[PDB]
Structure formats: structure tokens, C-alpha cells
Design a protein around this ligand. Structure first.
Ligand SMILES: *[C@@H]1O[C@H](CO)[C@@H](O)[C@H](O)[C@H]1NC(C)=O
Ligand SMILES: *[C@@H]1O[C@H](CO)[C@@H](O)[C@H](O)[C@H]1NC(C)=O
Lengths: 53, 53
């Protein structure tokens, strides 16, 4: 399914009709609405890390 | 001594026994390579300059 619909909030409906269960079971799932910049930092290995060669 | 002995680089040590010295004896030595030598042959080498600790 499209990624946008999950982001748009559409609750994709999954129906489960088990052999023993007489009543079908409905499951609807979407992205919960509710965004900050994860500024990445990459730390090089220390000399002591490199000291073991 | 013969200049050949000096040119060989043989070390000559002079001792002085006198009261004023701490243990009453001091010695100094000289060879071809340290008595006002013409040449200073140095091979100064440094490794692991950073050496953090
Ligand atoms: C001068 O130094 C270089 C390298 O340190 C060495 O290869 C050379 O033999 C030296 N020359 C003399 C005359 O000591
Ligand atoms: C001078 O130093 C170099 C480097 O340590 C060495 O290869 C050479 O034999 C030395 N020569 C003398 C005359 O001490």
C-alpha cells in the first residue's frame, strides 16, 4: 500500500474471520498524528581505540 | 698517547681524590668523539607525537 496513505492517516482495515470465531474481527491501523531535526554527529575513533593496532 | 690510540676512540678517564668531594673521588672521561669533536652525528627520532593520556 502507498506510504502516503499511512502518513495521510488512513486506517488500513484488516479483517480476521477465524474458523472458531463466529464474528469477524476488524483491525484498522494508521500513523498516530503528533517532528524535530536529528542533527547527526559521527565521532571518529579515538587514538586509544587505534592504539591497539 | 699515540695519535692512533686517540684516533681509535679509546676512552681515557682521569680521577681526582680530594677531601672536598662528596665521596672523595670524582672521574671524567674523554674520547675522540667528545673532546671538541668536529662533527655532531644526531639521529633524533620522535614517534607517536600525540600520545594523549
Ligand atoms: C649525517 O646524518 C645522516 C642521517 O642522520 C647519516 O646518514 C650520515 O651518515 C651522517 N653523516 C655523518 C658524516 O655523520
Ligand atoms: C651517524 O648516524 C647514523 C644514523 O644513526 C648512522 O647510520 C651512522 O653510522 C653514524 N655515523 C657515525 C660516524 O657515527
Amino acid at each position: 500500500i502507498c506510504e502516503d496513505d499511512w502518513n495521510s492517516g488512513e486506517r488500513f482495515t484488516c479483517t480476521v474471520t477465524h474458523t472458531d470465531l463466529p464474528s469477524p474481527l476488524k483491525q484498522t491501523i494508521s500513523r498516530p498524528k503528533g517532528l524535530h531535526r536529528p542533527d547527526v554527529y559521527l565521532l571518529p575513533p579515538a587514538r586509544e581505540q587505534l592504539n591497539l593496532r | 698517547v699515540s695519535e692512533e690510540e686517540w684516533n681509535t676512540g679509546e676512552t681515557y678517564t682521569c680521577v681526582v681524590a680530594h677531601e672536598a668531594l662528596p665521596n672523595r673521588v670524582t672521574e671524567r672521561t674523554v674520547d675522540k668523539s667528545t673532546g671538541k669533536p668536529t662533527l655532531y652525528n644526531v639521529s633524533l627520532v620522535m614517534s607517536d607525537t600525540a600520545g594523549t593520556c
